[PDB]
Amino acid sequence: MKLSKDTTALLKNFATINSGIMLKSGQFIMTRAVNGTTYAEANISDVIDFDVAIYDLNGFLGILSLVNDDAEISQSEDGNIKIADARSTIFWPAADPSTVVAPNKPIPFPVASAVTEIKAEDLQQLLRVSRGLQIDTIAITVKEGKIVINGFNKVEDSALTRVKYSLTLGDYDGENTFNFIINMANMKMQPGNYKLLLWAKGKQGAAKFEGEHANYVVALEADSTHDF
Amino acid sequence: MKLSKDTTALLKNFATINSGIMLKSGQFIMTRAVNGTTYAEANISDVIDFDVAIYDLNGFLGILSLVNDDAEISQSEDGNIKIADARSTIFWPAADPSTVVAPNKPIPFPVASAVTEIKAEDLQQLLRVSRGLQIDTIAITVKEGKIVINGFNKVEDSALTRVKYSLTLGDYDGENTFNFIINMANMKMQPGNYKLLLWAKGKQGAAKFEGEHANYVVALEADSTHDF
Amino acid sequence: MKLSKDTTALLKNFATINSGIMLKSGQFIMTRAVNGTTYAEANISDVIDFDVAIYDLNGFLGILSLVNDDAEISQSEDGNIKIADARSTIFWPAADPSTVVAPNKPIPFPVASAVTEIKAEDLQQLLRVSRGLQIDTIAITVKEGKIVINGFNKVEDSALTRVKYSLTLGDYDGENTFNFIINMANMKMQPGNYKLLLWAKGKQGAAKFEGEHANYVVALEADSTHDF
Numbered sequence: 001m002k003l004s005k006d007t008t009a010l011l012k013n014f015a016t017i018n019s020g021i022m023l024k025s026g027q028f029i030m031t032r033a034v035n036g037t038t039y040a041e042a043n044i045s046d047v048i049d050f051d052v053a054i055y056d057l058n059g060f061l062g063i064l065s066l067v068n069d070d071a072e073i074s075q076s077e078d079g080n081i082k083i084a085d086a087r088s089t090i091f092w093p094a095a096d097p098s099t100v101v102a103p104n105k106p107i108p109f110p111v112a113s114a115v116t117e118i119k120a121e122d123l124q125q126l127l128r129v130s131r132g133l134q135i136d137t138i139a140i141t142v143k144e145g146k147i148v149i150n151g152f153n154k155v156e157d158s159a160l161t162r163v164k165y166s167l168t169l170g171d172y173d174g175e176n177t178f179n180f181i182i183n184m185a186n187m188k189m190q191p192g193n194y195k196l197l198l199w200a201k202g203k204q205g206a207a208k209f210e211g212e213h214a215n216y217v218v219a220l221e222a223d224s225t226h227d228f
Numbered sequence: 229m230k231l232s233k234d235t236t237a238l239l240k241n242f243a244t245i246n247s248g249i250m251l252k253s254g255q256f257i258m259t260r261a262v263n264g265t266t267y268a269e270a271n272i273s274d275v276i277d278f279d280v281a282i283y284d285l286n287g288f289l290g291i292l293s294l295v296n297d298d299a300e301i302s303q304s305e306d307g308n309i310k311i312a313d314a315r316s317t318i319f320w321p322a323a324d325p326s327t328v329v330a331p332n333k334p335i336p337f338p339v340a341s342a343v344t345e346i347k348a349e350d351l352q353q354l355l356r357v358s359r360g361l362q363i364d365t366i367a368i369t370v371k372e373g374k375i376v377i378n379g380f381n382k383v384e385d386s387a388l389t390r391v392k393y394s395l396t397l398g399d400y401d402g403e404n405t406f407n408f409i410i411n412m413a414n415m416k417m418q419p420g421n422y423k424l425l426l427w428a429k430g431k432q433g434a435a436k437f438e439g440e441h442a443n444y445v446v447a448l449e450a451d452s453t454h455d456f
Numbered sequence: 457m458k459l460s461k462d463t464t465a466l467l468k469n470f471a472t473i474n475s476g477i478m479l480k481s482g483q484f485i486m487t488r489a490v491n492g493t494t495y496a497e498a499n500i501s502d503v504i505d506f507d508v509a510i511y512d513l514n515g516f517l518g519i520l521s522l523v524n525d526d527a528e529i530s531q532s533e534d535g536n537i538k539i540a541d542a543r544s545t546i547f548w549p550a551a552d553p554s555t556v557v558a559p560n561k562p563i564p565f566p567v568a569s570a571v572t573e574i575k576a577e578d579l580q581q582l583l584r585v586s587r588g589l590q591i592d593t594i595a596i597t598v599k600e601g602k603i604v605i606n607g608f609n610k611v612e613d614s615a616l617t618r619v620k621y622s623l624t625l626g627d628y629d630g631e632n633t634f635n636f637i638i639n640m641a642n643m644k645m646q647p648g649n650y651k652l653l654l655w656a657k658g659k660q661g662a663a664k665f666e667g668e669h670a671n672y673v674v675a676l677e678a679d680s681t682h683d684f
Contacts, residue, residue: 059588062588063585063588063589066581066584066585066588067581085581087578087623087624088578088581088621088622088623088624089621089622089623090585090589090620090621091618091619091620091621092589122315122316125294125295125316128294129291129294129318132287132290132291132294133291133318163319164318164319165316165317165318165319166316166317166318167315167316167317168315168316350543350544353522353523353544356522357519357522357544357546360515360518360519360522361519361546391547392546392547393544393545393546393547394544394545395543395544396543396544
C-alpha cells in the first residue's frame with residue numbers, strides 16, 4: 001500500500017485525537033479519543049492492504065516524510081511494518097491492539113434535530129480565539145432567530161452567563177429551542193468547511209461535523225438543554 | 229473605532245514598556261514604564277473615539293489580530309470593550325484608570341545639550357550584540373572627536389571600565405565633554421532611524437529618541453557625568 | 457584575519473562536535489570531542505594569522521554574524537579578540553588553553569581496508585531516521601555482494617539482532633568480511649557527499665569520512681568484527 005499526502009495529512013489530524021490508531025484493510029479510517037468524547041472517520045483515496053495497530057501515529061507519519069512518495073509500505077516478515085524506499089528500508093513496530101483504544105463498527109448518525117454550517121475562516125477564528133479568551137466551552141443556541149455559538153470561560157462562570165465570544169452561523173427556520181454545550185477541548189476537526197448536524201433526544205446529544213474529507217462527532221455536555 | 233495594522237504594531241511596542249495602557253480619544257498615544265524610567269508617545273493616523281484603560285494590552289492586541297480589519301472597537305454595554313465584526317463579536321474587559329500607571333501629560337523636550345542620530349542598522353546591531361555580550365548598560369560619550377556608544381556588563385564590571393562593544397555615531401561639533409549612561413533595560417524603542425537628543429542639567433539628564441512615528445524619553449543614570 | 461561565510465559554516469559545524477576550539481596560525485582547523493570519540497579537520501580558504509583558544513565557539517560565531525563580512529578580527533591589546541568593521545568594535549574573550557580540549561596533531565589515516573561512498577541524500581536520511589527510530593548504533597557490512605548500513609537500538613536490543621533501518625551504499629568489489637560498528641552519537645559530519653574509508657587491524661578500527669569541505673574520523677566500537 002502507499003499513502004498519498006492527503007491521507008497522511010488526515011492521519012496527522014487523527015493523531016491529535018488519539019496518539020495511536022487501528023488501521024484495517026480497505027479505504028476507511030477511524031479513531032476516537034481515549035475518553036470517547038470525540039470520534040472521527042474518513043474514506044481515503046489510498047487503500048490499506050493489511051490490519052495493523054500503530055501505537056505512535058505521529059511518529060510513524062514523521063518517518064514516512066523521510067522516504068520517497070512512491071515508498072511501498074507493507075507488513076514485515078516478523079509482523080511489523082516495512083517501508084521500502086528506492087535504496088533503503090525502514091521497519092516500524094506494530095503494536096498489540098490492546099494498547100490502542102479504537103472505536104467500534106460505524107453506525108449511521110441519527111436524523112438531525114437541527115442543521116447549520118460553519119465556514120473554515122470561522123472555525124479558525126473560533127479555535128484561535130479560545131486560546132486568548134480562555135474559552136473552554138461553547139454553546140450552540142438561538143438568538144433573534146439565528147443559530148449562534150457563544151463562548152464561555154467555565155472555570156470562572158459555572159452557569160455560562162458571561163458570553164466572551166459570539167459567532168452567528170445563519171438563520172434558523174425551525175421552531176424548537178436548545179442550548180447545546182460543547183467542550184472546546186473536543187473540537188479537533190481539521191481546518192475546513194463543515195455542515196453542522198445537531199442531534200438530541202432526552203439526555204442524549206451529539207454534534208456531527210460533516211466535512212469534505214472527514215466526519216467528526218463530538219458529545220454534548222450533560223448541561224445541555226432543549227425541547228426536541 | 230478601527231485600529232490599523234500600523235497602530236496595533238505601535239501599541240504592541242508600547243506593551244513592552246508597560247503591560248497596560250490608557251487610551252484617550254484623539255490621535256495621540258503615550259505610555260510610561262511603571263518604574264518611570266522610560267516614556268513613549270506617538271501620533272497615530274487612526275482616531276480613538278472613547279476613553280478606556282486596558283490592563284493587559286498584549287492580550288488585547290492578540291484578540292484584535294483575530295478579527296477582520298473592519299473590526300469596530302467600542303464601549304460595551306456594561307462599560308467594557310466590544311470588538312464587533314459583521315458576524316462575530318468579542319468582548320474584552322476595560323479596567324479602572326486608577327489601576328493603570330500612565331503619564332498625566334506629554335513630556336516635552338524643549339532643550340538639548342547635544343544632538344546626534346542613530347541609524348536603524350546600528351540600533352539593531354546594538355540591541356543584538358548587547359544580548360550576546362551580556363551588555364546591560366551603555367555610555368554615550370566623546371572619543372577623539374567622535375560621539376560613540378560604549379557597552380558594558382555592569383555585574384562583571386562595576387566601574388564601567390571594560391568596553392565590550394563600541395559604536396561610532398559620527399563626529400562631535402560641540403565643545404563639551406560628557407558620559408551619559410543608560411540602562412539597556414530602558415532601550416525599548418522599536419526598529420527604525422532616530423534623531424538623538426541628549427540633555428543634562430546638574431544631577432539631571434534625559435535622552436530622547438525621536439522616530440518617524442513614536443518618540444522615547446529615557447532618563448540617564450545617576451553616575452553620568454558632563455561639563456554642561 | 458577575515459572569516460568568510462564558508463569558514464564560519466564549517467566552524468559552526470565543528471562547534472557541534474566540541475563547544476570550544478583552539479585556532480592556530482595557518483590555513484587549517486581541527487577539533488575533537490571532549491570525550492575523544494570523533495575527530496574533524498579541514499583546509500580553509502582564509503588565513504588565521506594568530507593563535508587563540510575560544511571557549512564558546514557558537515557564541516563567537518553568533519557575534520560574527522552581527523557585523524559586516526569585511527570585519528577585521530584581531531589580537532586585542534590585552535590578549536583577547538577584537539572584531540571590527542566600518543563603525544563598530546566588538547571584544548570577545550580569548551580562553552586559557554586549559555579550559556578547552558583540543559586535538560594534538562593530525563595522525564595520518566592508515567591505508568584502508570575497504571572503501572565506499574555515501575551520497576548526501578543517503579546521509580541525511582540516515583541521520584533523520586536515526587532520530588525518529590531511536591537508532592543509537594549503525595553497522596557497516598556486506599550483504600549480497602553489497603556494502604550496507606544497518607541501524608539498531610542497542611538499549612532495546614543488546615545483541616544487535618533486530619535491524620530497524622537498512623541503507624544500500626553500493627556493491628563491494630572486494631572479497632573480505634566485516635561488521636564495523638559505529639555509535640550514532642559520533643556521526644557529526646556536516647551535510648554533503650562523502651567518500652567512506654574504513655580501516656581495521658586486529659582490535660583496532662576507524663572510519664574516515666572524506667568530504668569536499670572537511671574530513672571526519674570516528675573510531676569503531678569494540679564489538680566490530682573483520683577478517684582484514
